[PDB]
Structure 1
Amino acid sequence: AIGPVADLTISNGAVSPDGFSRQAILVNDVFPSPLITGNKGDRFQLNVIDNMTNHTMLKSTSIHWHGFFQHGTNWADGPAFVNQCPISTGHAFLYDFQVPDQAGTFWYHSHLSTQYCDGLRGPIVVYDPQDPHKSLYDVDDDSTVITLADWYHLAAKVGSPVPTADATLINGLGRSIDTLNADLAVITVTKGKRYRFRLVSLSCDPNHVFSIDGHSLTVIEADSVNLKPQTVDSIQIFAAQRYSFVLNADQDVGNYWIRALPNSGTRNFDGGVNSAILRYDGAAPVEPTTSQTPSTNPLVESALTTLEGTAAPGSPAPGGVDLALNMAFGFAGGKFTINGASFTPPTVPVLLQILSGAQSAQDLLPSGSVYSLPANADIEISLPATAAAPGFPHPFHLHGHTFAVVRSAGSSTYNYENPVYRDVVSTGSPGDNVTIRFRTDNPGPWFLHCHIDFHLEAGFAVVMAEDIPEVAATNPVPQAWSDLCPTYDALSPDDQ
């Protein structure tokens, strides 16, 4: 892997991850984007050098480091027009931040429009030298990162506004229905060894039901949060989520199908679509002939708990917090709404608005989309599922924070004692009332949005303006950040 100090050069080029070729986005001349790693406590210095020339996929860029708290470095978080203006082509920008108090599985992706769908997205691992789960496994390295991704034959701005994927990629490879002989990813294991696999969803839209024929999976991490171990036989993973699971390679030496069934597009495994190969050392170099058995032990989010058994912030009753917010989803004029407002990117990034003197949510643009949060407070947010926002279940993501999921999708119970904490949560289907809690210990504007990128583009977002009075003092910005907007605003539209 590369990192924690590295150049990330962004360019355009042709790729063929499902045996069909198209123009896309390369990072350090490769697709899919390379793995970046560090250790707990490391300073990351990622110099993003933008050499893109294709306006259809956008020449500008901005990168989000998904899951990092960015305390004191809100300017480095990535969302275009929230935390920065985009980097302009022919320029570079250094993201310089620390990860003092976090370890686990993360990822990076463009956070400008729908650009990450065109290929700028890759995994990150922050290792913990004192990982409490470390004695459960033998192997945890580049080879044990498993990414899932949707792939489209037409680019994000070329196809339908809400497209359906032609292929699922596993570690960057997969088959489409018209490319049944395309290359497949192979993950190799040695019989008798134990592996920490780190499963990362780079998806722009679909969720995937992940399973491995003949094997159970011991889940030990969700979205960079250590869990009490939970053995499962399938995992439904939503866009932008991560899980670590331990696999004991104790079955017969052979080839076993790795499966990732999407919730849209091709919903079968015919011809080896939506599949990869688990190969034991010594097995024949052939495709598996294993069968899928019904999942009788699927992952259930409400049954997950943190390793430390951390209580939810606040008191154990509905509304037992300093500020309770309800987000009512809707859809009007082809745009998503939250509490009647659709997010449209402001000309001046929200952070720059605050640093320039905006004092309240009413002062902040876009109007109706920004919520001021008090400092050092317990917050509860409910996000009740509704068919009024098409394309459910919507996996919501809160920047700058992990949150307690006090009520999960598909469950009527509330857990304040020992709920799972994570950073992306499915808000489920009608009848659900997914409810989250967090503490406001991190001054800055933080995006809260559906991580289905096509829905974000259609306005399905709000901004949480946390502790506005302390933002400037807590987040001193580098000169290079100050220069982003004047450079970007000087571009002609066709160079954006």
Structure 2
Amino acid sequence: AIGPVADLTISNGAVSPDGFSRQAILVNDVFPSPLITGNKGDRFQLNVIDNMTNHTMLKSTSIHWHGFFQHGTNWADGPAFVNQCPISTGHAFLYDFQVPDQAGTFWYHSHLSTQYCDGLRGPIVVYDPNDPHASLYDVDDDSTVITLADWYHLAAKVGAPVPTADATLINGLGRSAATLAADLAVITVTKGKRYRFRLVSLSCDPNYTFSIDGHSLTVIEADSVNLKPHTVDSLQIFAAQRYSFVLNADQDVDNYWIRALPNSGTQNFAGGTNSAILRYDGAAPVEPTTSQTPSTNPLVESALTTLKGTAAPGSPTPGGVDLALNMAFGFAGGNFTINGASFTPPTVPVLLQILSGAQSAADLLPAGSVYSLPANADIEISLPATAAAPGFPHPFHLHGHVFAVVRSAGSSTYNYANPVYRDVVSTGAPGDNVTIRFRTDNPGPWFLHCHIDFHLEAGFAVVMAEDIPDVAATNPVPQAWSDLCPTYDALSPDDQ
């Protein structure tokens, strides 16, 4: 409903998405943060004006446009101390980038510390005027975007380091244990019409098992990658993932529960918690009383494939690539590690370190957390799950890229011929060996990190420094970006 050229004014104020009032972060004076849209190939110019005054939730900010490749615009990707210094309060900064060759469902969120959990996070749709699935549906608009989010009555830096959510929000509304009369989100459909619902997880932590009573969901897109249509009766969506599914509203006129069960916190639907309402036009303005039927056809990620049936990069055998890396997870001293290193944000953002002459992974800070990748190559990364990294299953997101999921969680098999491609993948439970491949077609430093924000804060990340020698020439930076670090570094700590 706004974009692709827009101001995004960031401020603080009270919100009560589950009927409990608490201070949070507003965007253009609303919560939840507003939907941004554009079309395939568009230039987005999103001017982020930071007017936040609350240091507890951080006055500074930085925005990641989750899923966009940012080729040539690595400085716009958002992660603080990787791609930029934070925007300082009382300042604005223009993210100006293009989205060639992508269309689907995306989202934006703060990418400073655990700030997005305090409410800076909204959906983005990039429509495709030649969407290859356009004839599967009649309606695809602001009212078919569905977000899922975890909500806490204490702010991210006020509660426990890994807190448990008070409420699941669906399109910014939901109930907690003590607010069982709070308003539920309503999604309206007309009998006989087919809907492209674009489901986006804005979660800071839990994964949701999502279903709608009485209805199947025909999944057609995963994390902005078109799929062969695959009908399921439920699906599990991890933090920062997106699915488009077609719902054919061909059931009896009635209200039907939309359910989003989290993997932690309140795990039932008593009093309408973890729920929202699918209402057919003509149905009574009341809660559903429909029952859940057992899911016998859940989404299985290894069963999904791309619309094109694209092979994984490389040759169909383990290590069949230019560079293979294994990420060994651990946890010690209250910090997560990967291959023995815990990511601590460097004072000089990794992009700036490269622009200033750093040449190798050994040169780049933080030491032990940066991996140099060769240019124009195929890469394979395995991320075996382990109980040594508590709070599994951990979803990992690679910035700047889509990847082939050659091996998914809960599967023993490798698929090089036609695996799904996406950009956030669950690394699953101990015994799994989730394995991805991608091509290094995008010079720059890109975060690879766990999208449980509470764990990322705890160091659960590495940086892929891709094609270091070409990073500067590929990503010319605007002078507003070069002015971010001196502005930020001049702040006193209480103004951060």
Alignment TM class, shorter chain as reference:
over 0.9
Q: Report Cα offsets for 1:138-169 as digits up to 9, x if no partner.
A: 00000000000000000000000110000000
Q: How far apart, in 1, do the equivalents of 2:283 and 2:442 lie?
A: 51
> Displacement of 1:187 after TM fit?
0.3
Q: How far apart, in 2, do the equivalents of 1:41 and 1:236 lie?
A: 30
- Map of 1:383-422 to 2, 5 A cutoff? 383-422=383-422
> Displacement of 1:458 after TM fit?
0.1
> Displacement of 1:175 after TM fit?
0.1
> Displacement of 1:59 after TM fit?
0.2
Q: Report Cα offsets for 1:200-248 as digits up to 9, x if no partner.
A: 0000000000000000000000000000000000010000000000000
Task: List structure 1 runs of 4+ shifted beyond 3 angstroms.
Answer: none
Q: How far apart, in 2, do the equivalents of 1:372 and 1:286 lie?
A: 57
Q: Report Cα offsets for 1:412-466 as digits up to 9, x if no partner.
A: 0000000000000000001100000000000000000000000000000000000
Q: Does the residue aligned with 1:454 lie in a helix, a strand or coil?
A: helix
Q: How far apart, in 1, do the equivalents of 2:287 and 2:428 lie?
A: 35
> Which residue is 1:359 aligned to?
359
Q: How far apart, in 2, do the equivalents of 1:151 and 1:64 lie?
A: 20
Q: How far apart, in 2, do the equivalents of 1:101 and 1:479 lie?
A: 27
Q: Does the residue aligned with 1:362 lie in a helix, a strand or coil?
A: coil
Q: Report Cα offsets for 1:165-218 as digits up to 9, x if no partner.
A: 000000000000110000100000000000000000000000000000000000
Q: How many residues of Structure 1 are paired with residues of Structure 2 in the alignment?
A: 496
Q: Report Cα offsets for 1:338-371 as digits up to 9, x if no partner.
A: 0000000000000000000000000000000000
> Displacement of 1:271 after TM fit?
0.1
> Displacement of 1:467 after TM fit?
0.1
TM-score by structure 1 length? 1.00
Q: How far apart, in 2, do the equivalents of 1:101 and 1:246 lie?
A: 23
Q: How far apart, in 2, do the equivalents of 1:81 and 1:97 lie?
A: 19
Q: How far apart, in 2, do the equivalents of 1:437 and 1:281 lie?
A: 45
For the pair 1:337 / 2:343, whether they are aligned, the reply is no
Q: How far apart, in 1, do the equivalents of 2:432 and 2:346 lie?
A: 32
Q: How far apart, in 1, do the equivalents of 2:60 and 2:396 lie?
A: 25
Q: How far apart, in 2, do the equivalents of 1:284 and 1:396 lie?
A: 42
> Displacement of 1:408 after TM fit?
0.2
> Which residue is 1:14 aligned to?
14
Q: Does the residue aligned with 1:220 lie in a helix, a strand or coil?
A: strand
Q: How far apart, in 2, do the equivalents of 1:341 and 1:315 lie?
A: 30
> Which residue is 1:82 aligned to?
82
Percent identical residues = 95
Q: How far apart, in 2, do the equivalents of 1:286 and 1:156 lie?
A: 34
Q: How far apart, in 2, do the equivalents of 1:29 and 1:212 lie?
A: 32
Q: How far apart, in 1, do the equivalents of 2:100 and 2:340 lie?
A: 38
Q: Does the residue aligned with 2:362 lie in a helix, a strand or coil?
A: helix
> Which residue is 1:435 aligned to?
435
Unaligned runs of 5+ in 1: none
RMSD of Structure 2 on Structure 1 (CA) = 0.3
Q: Does the residue aligned with 1:363 lie in a helix, a strand or coil?
A: coil
Q: How far apart, in 2, do the equivalents of 1:431 and 1:447 lie?
A: 25
TM-score by structure 2 length? 1.00
Q: How far apart, in 1, do the equivalents of 2:32 and 2:431 lie?
A: 38
Q: Report Cα offsets for 1:6-40 as digits up to 9, x if no partner.
A: 00000000000000000000000000000000000
Q: How far apart, in 1, do the equivalents of 2:100 and 2:427 lie?
A: 30
Q: How far apart, in 2, do the equivalents of 1:103 and 1:258 lie?
A: 26
Q: Report Cα offsets for 1:274-328 as digits up to 9, x if no partner.
A: 0000000000111000000000000000000000000000000000000000000
- Map of 1:2-401 to 2, 5 A cutoff? 2-401=2-401
> Displacement of 1:125 after TM fit?
0.1
Q: Does the residue aligned with 2:481 lie in a helix, a strand or coil?
A: helix
Q: Report Cα offsets for 1:378-411 as digits up to 9, x if no partner.
A: 0000000100000000000000000000000000
Q: Does the residue aligned with 2:483 lie in a helix, a strand or coil?
A: helix
Q: Does the residue aligned with 2:381 lie in a helix, a strand or coil?
A: strand
Q: How far apart, in 1, do the equivalents of 2:15 and 2:430 lie?
A: 39
Q: Does the residue aligned with 2:135 lie in a helix, a strand or coil?
A: helix
Q: Does the residue aligned with 2:353 lie in a helix, a strand or coil?
A: helix
Q: How far apart, in 1, do the equivalents of 2:140 and 2:397 lie?
A: 27
Q: Report Cα offsets for 1:26-61 as digits up to 9, x if no partner.
A: 000000000000000100000000000000000000
Q: How far apart, in 2, do the equivalents of 1:216 and 1:62 lie?
A: 38
Q: How far apart, in 2, do the equivalents of 1:367 and 1:45 lie?
A: 34
For the pair 1:456 / 2:456, whether they are aligned, the reply is yes
Q: How far apart, in 1, do the equivalents of 2:379 and 2:115 lie?
A: 31
Q: How far apart, in 2, do the equivalents of 1:100 and 1:178 lie?
A: 47
Q: Does the residue aligned with 2:473 lie in a helix, a strand or coil?
A: helix
> Which residue is 2:483 aligned to?
483
> Displacement of 1:492 after TM fit?
0.4
Q: How far apart, in 2, do the equivalents of 1:473 and 1:56 lie?
A: 38
Q: How far apart, in 2, do the equivalents of 1:91 and 1:279 lie?
A: 43
Q: How far apart, in 2, do the equivalents of 1:135 and 1:386 lie?
A: 43
Q: How far apart, in 1, do the equivalents of 2:112 and 2:385 lie?
A: 26
> Displacement of 1:483 after TM fit?
0.1
Q: How far apart, in 2, do the equivalents of 1:156 and 1:391 lie?
A: 17
Q: How far apart, in 2, do the equivalents of 1:324 and 1:274 lie?
A: 40
Q: Does the residue aligned with 1:348 lie in a helix, a strand or coil?
A: coil
Q: How far apart, in 1, do the equivalents of 2:352 and 2:100 lie?
A: 26
Q: How far apart, in 2, do the equivalents of 1:202 and 1:363 lie?
A: 34
Q: Does the residue aligned with 1:256 lie in a helix, a strand or coil?
A: strand
Q: Does the residue aligned with 1:361 lie in a helix, a strand or coil?
A: coil
> Displacement of 1:91 after TM fit?
0.1
> Displacement of 1:84 after TM fit?
0.1
Q: How far apart, in 1, do the equivalents of 2:101 and 2:278 lie?
A: 34
Q: How far apart, in 2, do the equivalents of 1:315 and 1:264 lie?
A: 39
Q: How far apart, in 2, do the equivalents of 1:13 and 1:81 lie?
A: 27
Q: Does the residue aligned with 1:480 lie in a helix, a strand or coil?
A: helix
